[PDB]
Tab-separated table of C-alpha atoms in Angstrom:
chain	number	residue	atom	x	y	z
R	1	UNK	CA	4.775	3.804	-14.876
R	2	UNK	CA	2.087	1.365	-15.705
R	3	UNK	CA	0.034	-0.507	-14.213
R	4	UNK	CA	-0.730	-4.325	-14.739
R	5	UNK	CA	-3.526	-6.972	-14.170
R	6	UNK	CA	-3.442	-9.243	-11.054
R	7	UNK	CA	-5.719	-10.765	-9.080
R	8	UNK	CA	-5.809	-11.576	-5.578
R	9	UNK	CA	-5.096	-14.581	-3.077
R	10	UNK	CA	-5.191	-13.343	-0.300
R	11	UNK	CA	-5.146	-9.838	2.004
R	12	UNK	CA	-2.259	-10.095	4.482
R	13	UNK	CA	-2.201	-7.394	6.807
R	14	UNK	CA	-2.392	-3.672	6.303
R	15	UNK	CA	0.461	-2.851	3.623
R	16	UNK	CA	1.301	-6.527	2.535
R	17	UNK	CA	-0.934	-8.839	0.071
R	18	UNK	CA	-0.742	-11.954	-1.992
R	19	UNK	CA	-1.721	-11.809	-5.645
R	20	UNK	CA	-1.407	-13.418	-8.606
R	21	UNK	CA	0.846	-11.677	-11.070
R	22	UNK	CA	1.704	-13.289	-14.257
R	23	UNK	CA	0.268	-16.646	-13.566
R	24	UNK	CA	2.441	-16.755	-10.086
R	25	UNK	CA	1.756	-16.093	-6.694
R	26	UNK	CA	3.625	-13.327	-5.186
R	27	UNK	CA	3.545	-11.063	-1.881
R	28	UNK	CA	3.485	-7.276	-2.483
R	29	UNK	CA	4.850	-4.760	-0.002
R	30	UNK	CA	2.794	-1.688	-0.685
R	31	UNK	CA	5.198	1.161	-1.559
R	32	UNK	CA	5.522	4.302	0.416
R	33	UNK	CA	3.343	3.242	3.187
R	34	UNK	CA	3.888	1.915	6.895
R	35	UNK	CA	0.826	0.164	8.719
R	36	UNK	CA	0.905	-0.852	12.264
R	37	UNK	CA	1.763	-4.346	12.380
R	38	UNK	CA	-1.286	-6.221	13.737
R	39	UNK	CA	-0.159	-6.440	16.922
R	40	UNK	CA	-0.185	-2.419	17.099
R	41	UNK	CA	-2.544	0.176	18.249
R	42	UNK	CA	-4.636	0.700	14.116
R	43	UNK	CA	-2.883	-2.931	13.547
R	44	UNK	CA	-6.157	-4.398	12.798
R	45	UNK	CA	-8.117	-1.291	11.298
R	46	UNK	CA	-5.653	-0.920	8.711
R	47	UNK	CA	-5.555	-4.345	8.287
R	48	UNK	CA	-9.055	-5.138	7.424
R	49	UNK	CA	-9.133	-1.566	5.636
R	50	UNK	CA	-6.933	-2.805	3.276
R	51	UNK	CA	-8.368	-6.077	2.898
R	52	UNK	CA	-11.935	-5.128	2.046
R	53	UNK	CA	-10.927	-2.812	-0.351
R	54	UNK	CA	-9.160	-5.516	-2.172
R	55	UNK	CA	-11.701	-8.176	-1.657
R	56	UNK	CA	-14.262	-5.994	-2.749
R	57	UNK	CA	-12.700	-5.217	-5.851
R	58	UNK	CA	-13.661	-6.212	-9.635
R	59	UNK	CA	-10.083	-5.597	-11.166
R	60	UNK	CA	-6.794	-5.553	-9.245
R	61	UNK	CA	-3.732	-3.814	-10.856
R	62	UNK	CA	-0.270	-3.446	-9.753
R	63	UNK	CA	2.283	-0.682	-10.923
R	64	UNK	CA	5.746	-1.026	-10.368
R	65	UNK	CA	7.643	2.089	-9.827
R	66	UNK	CA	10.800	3.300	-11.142
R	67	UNK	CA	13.493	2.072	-8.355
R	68	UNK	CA	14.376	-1.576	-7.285
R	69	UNK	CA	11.298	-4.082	-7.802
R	70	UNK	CA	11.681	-6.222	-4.823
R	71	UNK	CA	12.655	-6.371	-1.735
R	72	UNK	CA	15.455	-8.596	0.282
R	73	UNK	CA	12.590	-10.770	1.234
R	74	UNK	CA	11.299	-11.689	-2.473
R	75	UNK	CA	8.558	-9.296	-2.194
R	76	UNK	CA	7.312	-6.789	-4.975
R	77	UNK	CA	7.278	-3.405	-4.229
R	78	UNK	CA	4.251	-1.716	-6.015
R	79	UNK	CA	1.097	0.488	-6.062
R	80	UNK	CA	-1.625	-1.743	-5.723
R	81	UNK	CA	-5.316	-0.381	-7.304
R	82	UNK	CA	-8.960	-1.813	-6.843
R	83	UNK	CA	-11.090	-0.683	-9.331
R	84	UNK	CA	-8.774	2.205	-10.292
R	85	UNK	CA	-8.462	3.763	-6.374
R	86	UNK	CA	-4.948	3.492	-5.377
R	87	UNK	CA	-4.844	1.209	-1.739
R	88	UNK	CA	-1.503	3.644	-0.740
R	89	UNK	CA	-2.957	6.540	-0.761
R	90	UNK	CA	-6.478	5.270	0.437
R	91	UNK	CA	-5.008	3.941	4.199
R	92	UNK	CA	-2.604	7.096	4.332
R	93	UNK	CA	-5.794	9.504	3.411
R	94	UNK	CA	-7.614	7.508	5.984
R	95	UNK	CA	-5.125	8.056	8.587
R	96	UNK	CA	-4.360	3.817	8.772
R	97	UNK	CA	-0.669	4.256	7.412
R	98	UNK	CA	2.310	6.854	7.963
R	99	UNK	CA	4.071	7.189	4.918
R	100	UNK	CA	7.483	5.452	4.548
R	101	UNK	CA	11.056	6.196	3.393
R	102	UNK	CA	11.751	6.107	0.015
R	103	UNK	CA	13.137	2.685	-0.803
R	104	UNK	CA	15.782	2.567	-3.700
R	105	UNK	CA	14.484	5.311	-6.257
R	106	UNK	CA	10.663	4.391	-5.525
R	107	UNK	CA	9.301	7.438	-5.358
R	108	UNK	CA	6.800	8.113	-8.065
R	109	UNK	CA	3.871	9.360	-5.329
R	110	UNK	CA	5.756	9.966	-2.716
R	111	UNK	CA	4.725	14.050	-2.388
R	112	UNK	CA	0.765	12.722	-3.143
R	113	UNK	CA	0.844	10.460	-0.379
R	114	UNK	CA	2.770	13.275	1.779
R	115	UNK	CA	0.002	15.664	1.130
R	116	UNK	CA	-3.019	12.762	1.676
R	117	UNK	CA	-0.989	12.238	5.236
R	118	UNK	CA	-0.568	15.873	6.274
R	119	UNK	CA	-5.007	15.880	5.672
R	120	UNK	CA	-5.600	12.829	7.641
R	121	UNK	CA	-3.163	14.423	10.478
R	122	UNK	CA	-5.099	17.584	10.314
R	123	UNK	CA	-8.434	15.747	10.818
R	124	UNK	CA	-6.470	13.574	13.275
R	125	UNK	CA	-7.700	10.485	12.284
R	126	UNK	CA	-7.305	7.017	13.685
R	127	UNK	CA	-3.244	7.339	13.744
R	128	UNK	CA	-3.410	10.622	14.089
R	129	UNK	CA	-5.734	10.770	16.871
């Protein structure tokens, strides 16, 4: 995998943001992870987790993994970095996201964001509380 330049337009809610990525704008569906939606007990923790740690970063990247790209909905399915600190991992670790199926091969980090989750469960934190 690699990752790639973007730069951000906007945080959307916990696991979803709008970047630019290649000179277009695009939603991203983080991969691997599950926030509340806002309207859900963490909604808006993981929510504004997410979005100060993109909005607060010098350089976003994105890395595609090794399965289908996008989803049904025209969104990209990536990791998502700020400053070289992987956002998936970061809201699992901090006990803001469950982690998700595997979608369609993606599954690159899949047992590091299992083990972050099993450590935020055993601190039971925020979700996990």
């Amino acid at each position: 995998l690699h990752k790639e330049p973007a730069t951000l337009i906007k945080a959307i809610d916990g696991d979803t943001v709008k970047l630019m990525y290649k000179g277009q704008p695009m939603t991203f569906r983080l991969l691997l992870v599950d926030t509340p939606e806002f309207n859900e007990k963490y909604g808006p923790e993981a929510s504004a987790f997410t979005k100060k740690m993109v909005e607060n970063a010098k350089k976003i990247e994105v890395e595609f993994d090794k399965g289908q790209r996008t989803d049904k909905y025209g969104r990209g399915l990536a990791y998502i970095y700020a400053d070289g600190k992987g956002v998936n991992e970061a809201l699992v670790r901090q006990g803001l996201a469950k982690v998700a199926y595997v979608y369609k091969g993606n599954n690159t980090h899949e047992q590091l964001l299992r083990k972050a989750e099993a450590q935020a469960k055993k601190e039971k934190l925020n979700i996990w509380s």
